[PDB]
Amino acid sequence: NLNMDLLYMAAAVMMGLAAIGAAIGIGILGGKFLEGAARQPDLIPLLRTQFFIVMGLVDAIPMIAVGLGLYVMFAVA
Amino acid sequence: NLNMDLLYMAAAVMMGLAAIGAAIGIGILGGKFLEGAARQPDLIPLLRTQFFIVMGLVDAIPMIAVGLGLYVMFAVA
Amino acid sequence: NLNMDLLYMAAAVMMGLAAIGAAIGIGILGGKFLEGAARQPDLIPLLRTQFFIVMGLVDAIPMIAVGLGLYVMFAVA
Amino acid sequence: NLNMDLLYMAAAVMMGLAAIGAAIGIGILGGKFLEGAARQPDLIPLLRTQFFIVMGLVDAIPMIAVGLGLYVMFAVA
Amino acid sequence: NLNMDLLYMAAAVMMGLAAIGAAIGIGILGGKFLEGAARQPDLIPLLRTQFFIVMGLVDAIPMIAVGLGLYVMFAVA
Amino acid sequence: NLNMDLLYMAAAVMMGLAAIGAAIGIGILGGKFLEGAARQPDLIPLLRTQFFIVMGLVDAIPMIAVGLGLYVMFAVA
Amino acid sequence: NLNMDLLYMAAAVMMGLAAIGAAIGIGILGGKFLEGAARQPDLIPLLRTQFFIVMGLVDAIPMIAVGLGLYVMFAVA
Amino acid sequence: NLNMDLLYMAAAVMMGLAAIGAAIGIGILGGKFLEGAARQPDLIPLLRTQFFIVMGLVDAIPMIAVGLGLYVMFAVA
Amino acid sequence: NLNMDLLYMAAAVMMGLAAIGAAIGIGILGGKFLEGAARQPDLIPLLRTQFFIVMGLVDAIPMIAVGLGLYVMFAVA
Amino acid sequence: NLNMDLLYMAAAVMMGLAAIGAAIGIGILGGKFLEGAARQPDLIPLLRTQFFIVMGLVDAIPMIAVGLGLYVMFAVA
Amino acid sequence: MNLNATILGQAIAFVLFVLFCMKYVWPPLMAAIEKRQKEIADGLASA
Amino acid sequence: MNLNATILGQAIAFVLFVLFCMKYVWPPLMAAIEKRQKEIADGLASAERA
Amino acid sequence: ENMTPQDYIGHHLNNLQLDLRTFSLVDPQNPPATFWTINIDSMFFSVVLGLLFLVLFRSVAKKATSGVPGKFQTAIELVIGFVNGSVKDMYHGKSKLIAPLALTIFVWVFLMNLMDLLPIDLLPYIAEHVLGLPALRVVPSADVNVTLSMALGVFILILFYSIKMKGIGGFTKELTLQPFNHWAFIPVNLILEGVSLLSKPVSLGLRLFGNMYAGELIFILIAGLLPWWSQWILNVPWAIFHILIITLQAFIFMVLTIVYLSMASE
């Protein structure tokens, strides 16, 4: 039957779009971290601590999508 | 055939687009938080509490789509 | 049977596209609120009031898109 | 079967793309309003009046796209 | 006949893409008008005159696309 | 027959994508004109002349796509 | 037969994507010209000459795509 | 048969997306050249030399997609 | 037969979206590095070190997607 | 015959999306190189070496996708 | 295109040319260049 | 397809490329080599006269 | 001669090969399925361009005089100074290998790419008519196997330098505890740094292959499809653009090799 391969296609769309969102979201956020670290090079530990707080939120929704993509490819299909 | 594989494809479109929207929206907002923090290092608690007010609204509408995508896979399919 | 099974795909497209629009729109708008709050920190309750006025307009079209998506899944299909 | 399904899909793509247009356009316009408000806060009632003029134009063309989407679901069925 | 539902789908993509283009185009143009008004508030009627000239060009292609999509939906189908 | 379904859909893609390209291109170019007009009034007719030179190039490819979309609907279909 | 209907669809997608690329590419390039002119209008002929050099490269790939789109539509038909 | 028209569609997708990539990448790169040329008008030939060095890299990947698009369209069948 | 063929299409969407995500994310992050290095040339080894830390996170999700794309083509084929 | 046409449409997705990703990623990065070269022209050889270091990361992931697209057309055929 | 025993045949060729270039080409060229740079630097030491 | 025609067209295209390459590419290369010989001649003359 | 232009384009993309089961010549209408079918034409042009690089540089290296240099000597010392300046900026360790490795990579990849500029029929015509060989194509870097052989050479050096500089301590730590630090992430860290490590050589090889293969394919298409009086107008602009690409792709293979070995060792 065809079905088992439209499960691979469903996981592929879900995991690819989650990789777009995770990579661009951290790219934008990290660029503004480096701009702050260039201006204030004695504040790198403070700015890096805040960056890890907000970066965890950026990753949180893409990590759900990537986990469900792995479930569909390995466990269901 | 079609019923299950289209329900997984629909869930993949909801969670893929919610991962795009939530990750880029929080990435942009977090970039302005980290530049504000580098500009005003006495105000990280004031700007991070404003950031959590704004972030709740940004995440809320993608979280409808993620929760309903999980309903589509687990409880419809 | 394919007519209702594709109605779940129709709702998935409609609310997924609304979720990227709403999350990026509030992300940009909130970013300019946090930059204003960092430049004028005694001004935050006035700027937050204005952010809530314009955030209601930004949400108004996505919220009717999400509401019609939920209707398509629950009431039509 | 499929004719009535494809009408609901046509409304889903029409309102989904209209929800992106309306939310992004007002998100950008409202961000530049909020920076004008933070730079000169005694000027806010004037800038808010100009924002409502410009926002009416931005929102008007998505609103005919939404109105035709509801016509396709409710009236054409 | 399949011809009817494909004509409603063709109108839906034509008007959805026109609503994205026209709403984001006027959103960017209006944002630069509102920061110009915040910088030079005694010039606002002059900048309105130029904004309405430029807005006519931005709308001219999307209003053709809406006019033909609405013709396809009402007259051809 | 099938020819009209696919020809109206082909025109709808061609003119919808041209409406994105023209509206975003003139929106970006026009916003930079309006910040120039707020920065230097009394240069408005000179900056408007340069804006109309550049606008002719921005419109040139989208106007080919509009003219051929009108040919596909009115002459081929 | 279907061959001609898909060839009009192929020419339409190739020229739509060429129209987006060419119009936004010249819109970004021209916006940076207009702000460099507004700052010091004594350089308008110098910057306009460099603009025409860069704009030639921006047009070069989209015109390959338009030339092949016209060939598909008229000559492969 | 179906073979040829789907090969012309696959070529149209390579050629269109290459026209997006080349036109937007050189538009961004050229905008930063023109603002550098306005900033340092004695150094236009030095900045133009580096512009051609990085423009070779931006054009290189789209030219792979153009070369294979012409091979699929003309030479494979 | 069709299962094997569609698995090459499913890998193609995973690797295309992983390529866009990685290249745009690192391009935004690296641009903010190369502009911090030009403004503060004594800080390059520090900004280079923080760039490689942040870039490891930007790489992390695209490497899951591309590694699974290679698995889908070569192992299940 | 049927298996080969879909294989040419799979390669067209890989190479089109990787051409957009790599061209715009290098365009953003190269624009920041040309900005830094206009601000401090005496750094232009140093910033050139930092550009080539970061550019090797930016187009590393897209080159895996371009190479497998060339494998699919020429080896899997 | 086809992955092939040429990958090994080129791997032998590359390592032979890197060993010949490393001993024979690079030391005599860099000795001759640095010998001139030292003689100019001692020419500045006269000042 | 005429194979001899494809050889004729490749010959015309190579001659036009060689005329571009000689005028644009070779003067920069020969000017860089003569600039090095000038800088070494000045450097050795200055070093030996000092 | 029966050529349809699609068939001419097809034959131009076929290599000359040796069947090591028999030492026969794999005629280009039936390819043997074995992995022992060495490509003769990329092997011959790869070693002959490597020999020509070493003959020119050794001839100057053996003569070279620290007076005012000759005009040819000045050209070779310019490329020695350009490679050493690149290495000395990017790498700071004591190794005797990195500088000559970077010289051979830059000059050999440049020479291999430079074969692509020559007319696409001239050497294949001479090989078909005068030598009688069933096929030929003359750009080594355009073929995958040479670029993956160089990229795997740099992979083996990336492993050698990372083990030697830091061994039982450093390589196990960087594979297991990065980027996410805590021991709870070790399985994820091992996958992400594994694919990061493997991405450095595979992208080196595919970068160089993809640019030279599409560069040659345009000259095969322009020669194949267009009539003689009209080839030069598209061909001359492509040749002029390709001169920029051959030097950039040779330079990027050198730069990324130095950067990856410098980042591995230091």
Residue numbers in the entry:
A (entry chain O), B (entry chain P), C (entry chain I), D (entry chain Q), E (entry chain L), F (entry chain J), ...: 3 to 79
K (entry chain X): 1 to 47
L (entry chain Y): 1 to 50
M (entry chain a): 4 to 269
The authors write:
A key component in the generation of cellular metabolic energy is the F1Fo ATP synthase, a biological rotary motor that converts the proton motive force (pmf) to adenosine tri-phosphate (ATP) in both oxidative phosphorylation and photophosphorylation. The Fo motor spans the membrane and converts the potential energy from the pmf into mechanical rotation of the central rotor that, in turn, drives conformational changes in the catalytic F1 motor subunits to generate ATP from ADP and inorganic phosphate (Pi). Here we have used cryo-Electron Microscopy (cryo-EM) on detergent-solubilized cysteine free E. coli ATP synthase13 to probe its structure and understand its rotational dynamics and coupling.
However, the reconstructions were still anisotropic due to preferential alignment to the F1-ATPase, so focused refinement using a mask of the Fo region was performed on Sub-state 3A resulting in a detailed map to 3.3 Å resolution of the Fo motor. A particularly interesting feature seen in this study are the positions of aArg210 and cAsp61, residues that are known to be essential for proton translocation. Furthermore residues aAsn214, aHis245, aAsn119, and aGlu219, that are also known to be important from mutagenesis studies, form a chain of residues between the aqueous channel and rotation path of cAsp61. A deep funnel-like evagination can be observed on the cytoplasmic side of the membrane that likely facilitates deprotonation of the c-ring near aSer199, which is adjacent to cAsp61. When all the density corresponding to protein had been assigned, tube-like non-protein density likely corresponding to lipid molecules were observed in multiple locations within the membrane bound Fo-motor. Without the lipid(s), the interaction surface between subunit a and the c-ring would be limited to three of the ten c subunits, whereas with the lipid-mediated interaction this is increased by an additional c subunit to four.
